[PDB]
Design a protein around this ligand. Structure first.
Ligand code: XIR
Length: 339
């Protein structure tokens, strides 16, 4: 293990108080993920805490992180005032056989926020703040010179900047790509995976908007909207809410028959118990008329029927099966939900 320094998962074994390169004092592990670890460090030179993503000493992670660095640096050539809600990569270096990405220090991810609500959700008002930021972030990523598809939006990859404000940033561009790259497939985290990707179809930046629609519902209900145990269960759970996808899409989907078959009348239906297609209404998931998710927002300011109907509309537009008509970031931002 790399001159001593690695565990059996090819992680750097953090030693609290270690100094690196006469510059960073490692304080502690913040958290682990697939890619490796994020540690809290003090940068003596800039005099600030930084979150150092220490990539596993494994080629696949190293290579993914090099793609991440490239995309972050590209995003940086634009967002120098850090306006657009993407985590700032300060610098990167190889250290003891681990690629290290030095980020600004942020705070809890939105999953952990949901965990602190006991998976019962945050307010629609907070949901709206997250939504507005996330739509602005997507707006940014879709700037032509970037055209970046995050490809793994989920609550864990959206972080509070700090524990007392509603400001957030997107993290983790390990799985990201630019438009026209199509080599990736079975991409996105399953709960947040777009129909086009489930269907093995060409995809674009609209996949991120699908993920966001899923995320926003979850932020408010506390629970994943579409919590499939596998792709088939995923598509089924999607269909429960949204109905059979448009025929014009299914006729074009290489993986149509993973999920669907044509009936003798030439129409598409599921292969296989679930609520029948389109019968699990978002109207009811959100509790539009019944005091919000599980009735728990009954009375609360900012949780009116009118508010929920606006939120539902926005969400349904994000969860358009058709990536061509799925609401784009700009128009999402103009939605009545945000007035
Ligand atoms: C607190 C904190 N600030 C961070 C800044 C950047 C990143 C990051 C992580 C991954 N990819 C990129 N591009 C940036 N992470 C930051 N974190 C942070 C927050 C929470 C966790 N976890 C991970 C999972 N665990 C179960 C809960 C806490 C973390 F590792 C880092």
């Amino acid at each position: 293990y790399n001159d001593g320094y690695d565990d059996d998962n090819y992680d750097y074994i953090v030693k609290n108080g270690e100094k690196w390169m006469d510059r960073y004092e490692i304080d502690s592990l913040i958290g682990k993920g697939s890619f490796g670890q994020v540690v809290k460090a003090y940068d003596r030179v800039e005099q600030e805490w930084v979150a150092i993503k220490i990539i596993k000493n494994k080629k696949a992670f190293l290579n993914q992180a090099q793609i991440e660095v490239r995309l972050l640096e590209l995003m940086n050539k634009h967002d120098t005032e850090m306006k657009y809600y993407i985590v700032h990569l300060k610098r990167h270096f190889m250290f003891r056989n681990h690629l290290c990405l030095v980020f600004e220090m942020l705070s809890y991810n939105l999953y952990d926020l949901l965990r602190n609500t006991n998976f019962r959700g945050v307010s629609l008002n907070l949901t709206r703040k997250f939504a507005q930021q996330m739509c602005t972030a997507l707006l940014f990523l879709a700037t032509p010179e970037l055209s970046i598809i995050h490809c793994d939006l989920k609550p864990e990859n959206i972080l509070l900047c700090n524990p007392k404000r509603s400001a957030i940033k997107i993290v983790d561009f390990g799985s990201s790509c630019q438009l026209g790259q199509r080599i990736y497939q079975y991409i996105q985290s399953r709960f947040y995976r777009s129909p086009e990707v489930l269907l093995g179809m060409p995809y674009d930046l609209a996949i991120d908007m699908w993920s966001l629609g899923c995320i926003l519902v979850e932020m408010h209900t506390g629970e994943p909207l579409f919590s499939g145990a596998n792709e088939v269960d995923q598509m089924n759970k999607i269909v429960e809410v949204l109905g059979i996808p448009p025929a014009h899409i299914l006729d074009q989907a290489p993986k149509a028959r993973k999920f669907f078959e044509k009936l003798p009348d030439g129409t598409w239906n599921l292969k296989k118990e679930y609520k029948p297609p389109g019968t699990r209404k978002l109207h009811n998931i959100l509790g539009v008329e019944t005091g919000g998710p599980g009735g728990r927002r009954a009375g609360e300011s900012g949780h009116t029927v009118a508010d929920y109907l606006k939120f539902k509309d926005l969400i349904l537009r994000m969860l358009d099966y058709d990536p061509k008509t799925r609401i784009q970031p700009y128009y999402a931002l103009q939605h009545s939900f945000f007035k």
